[PDB]
Amino acid sequence: QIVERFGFSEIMRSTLEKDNTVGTDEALLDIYRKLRPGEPPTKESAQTL
Amino acid sequence: DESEALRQARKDAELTASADSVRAYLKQIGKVALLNAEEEVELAKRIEAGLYATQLMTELSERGEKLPAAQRRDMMWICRDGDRAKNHLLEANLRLVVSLAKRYTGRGMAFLDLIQEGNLGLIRAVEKFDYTKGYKFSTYATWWIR
Amino acid sequence: LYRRVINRNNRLKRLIDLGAPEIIVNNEKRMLQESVDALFDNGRRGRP
Amino acid sequence: APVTHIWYFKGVPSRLGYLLDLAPKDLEKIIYFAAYVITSVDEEMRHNELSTLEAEMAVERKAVEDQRDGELEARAQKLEADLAELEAEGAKADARRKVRDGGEREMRQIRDRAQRELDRLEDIWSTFTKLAPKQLIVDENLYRELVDRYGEYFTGAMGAESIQKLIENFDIDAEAESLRDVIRNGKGQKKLRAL
DNA sequence: CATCCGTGAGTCGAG
DNA sequence: TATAATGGGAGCTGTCACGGATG
């Protein structure tokens, strides 16, 4: 759906490609890890905030 | 379900210490696990043994005479195991204090100072606890911390 | 600020004496440190 | 409890940091009680027992491995025995593949659990072997494991008074000339921080 | 050559 | 002062130009 909605531009295609990780779990965890360090990352604690 | 990434990711966050002096204390408390009703009883039992071995030797040192090397050593270990149990219970219900210390925020006294004084009441609380009555520790604590 | 420090300095005394676990004692100490810090130079470290 | 003058710590360049060759960020995690700091080590006593200490650590490392390879064996036994048990029931061969991948998942976990122990046991022995003043041990459980095992061999403290200790056992005259030697060397970036 | 933190940014008076 | 009670809560918004430590 990322390819669908923002595919008309090369700058977004270059973004999804340079994208480090994939996966709904791995994204939430990633953002959680950069927002509040010092706290245990549950899959239910990154979905919540 | 449990990836190696998360397992490395979890220790990375936990290990790094935040800048907020309030947060850094919270994270410290969350380490020790909450206590089972009968787990509480156990520690109570030990502290009683521990607290009592101490009162024995205390009046003995003043009057003079002391136990043999076999008795004193065995006596002494209870005094340590007791003073270790006491420290465990305090670390357990250390959350309890911070629970009812948030409620006196913004009253001309700082949060941390509230939590400390809070803990300070918790220390007295565990001392005069009694496990003869089947009441959990949480109820004879609250009245002491407040 | 002075009243802040002495309150935390004294509370340390009572805690050390009572034989508090290290988690409590240290929390005081840390606080004592920010309290002397806040009095000498406020806002320098952390929030004022 | 001793407490450090914020004028010398947070003022940049961090005068205390420069004095003890301690990092400005590492200094933080110490003074404000987020990370222990090694204060002094009996290197000799470490040496004169280093042979025996190695053997001891080793035995634990073996006995950990021995359980692993044993634990794994019994699961491999029951993995092959169950796959045949569901074969004697006449289940679909695809329904056995679920049981197959199940075992291989269980064995992997076992190995990883053990391996984490062995890595911890590695991180412990490595840390004790290479221990010295002005080292930060931010990981607590390690430090607790570090004291419980080799607490006789070093002096670890935390907070403003540990840094007090470090200043006491600071040799000015020695640390001075040591800087002058790095200055006598042409190496720029390291002469910068030594100047 | 470009970022991040800490420190500058006229005077008197008035309320 | 014995029912049982167990991890906070507001964030602050629109500078500007510079040196020093880091890159």
Curated annotation (Swiss-Prot), chain A:
It comes from the Bacteria. Belongs to the RNA polymerase beta chain family. The RNAP catalytic core consists of 2 alpha, 1 beta, 1 beta' and 1 omega subunit. When a sigma factor is associated with the core the holoenzyme is formed, which can initiate transcription. Interacts with CarD, TRCF (Mfd) and RbpA. DNA-dependent RNA polymerase catalyzes the transcription of DNA into RNA using the four ribonucleoside triphosphates as substrates. This is DNA-directed RNA polymerase subunit beta. It comes from Mycobacterium tuberculosis (strain ATCC 25618 / H37Rv). The lineage of its organism: Bacteria, Bacillati, Actinomycetota, Actinomycetes, Mycobacteriales.
Curated annotation (Swiss-Prot), chain B:
One of its GO terms (biological process) is response to water. One of its GO terms (cellular component) is plasma membrane. Induction: Constitutively expressed under all conditions tested except for 3-fold reduction in stationary phase, standing culture and upon growth in H(2)O. 2-fold induced by starvation. Half-life of over 40 minutes. Residues 19-53 are annotated as: Sigma-70 factor domain-1. One of its GO terms (molecular function) is sigma factor activity. Its main location: cytoplasm. The keyword Cell membrane does not apply. Keywords: Cytoplasm, DNA-binding, Sigma factor, Transcription, Transcription regulation. A motif (Interaction with polymerase core subunit RpoC) lies at residues 113-116. Was identified as a high-confidence drug target. Belongs to the sigma-70 factor family. RpoD/SigA subfamily. Interacts transiently with the RNA polymerase catalytic core formed by RpoA, RpoB, RpoC and RpoZ (2 alpha, 1 beta, 1 beta' and 1 omega subunit) to form the RNA polymerase holoenzyme that can initiate transcription. Interacts with WhiB3 and probably with RbpA probably via its sigma-2 region. The sigma-70 factor domain-2 mediates sequence-specific interaction with the -10 element in promoter DNA, and plays an important role in melting the double-stranded DNA and the formation of the transcription bubble. The sigma-70 factor domain-2 mediates interaction with the RNA polymerase subunits RpoB and RpoC. Sigma factors are initiation factors that promote the attachment of RNA polymerase to specific initiation sites and are then released. This sigma factor is the primary sigma factor during exponential growth. This is RNA polymerase sigma factor SigA. It comes from Mycobacterium tuberculosis (strain ATCC 25618 / H37Rv). The chain holds residues 207 to 352 of 528 of the full protein.
UniProtKB/Swiss-Prot annotation, chain C:
Induction: 6-fold repressed by starvation. DNA-dependent RNA polymerase catalyzes the transcription of DNA into RNA using the four ribonucleoside triphosphates as substrates. The RNAP catalytic core consists of 2 alpha, 1 beta, 1 beta' and 1 omega subunit. When a sigma factor is associated with the core the holoenzyme is formed, which can initiate transcription. Belongs to the RNA polymerase beta' chain family. This is DNA-directed RNA polymerase subunit beta'. It comes from Mycobacterium tuberculosis (strain ATCC 25618 / H37Rv). The chain holds residues 343 to 390 of 1316 of the full protein.
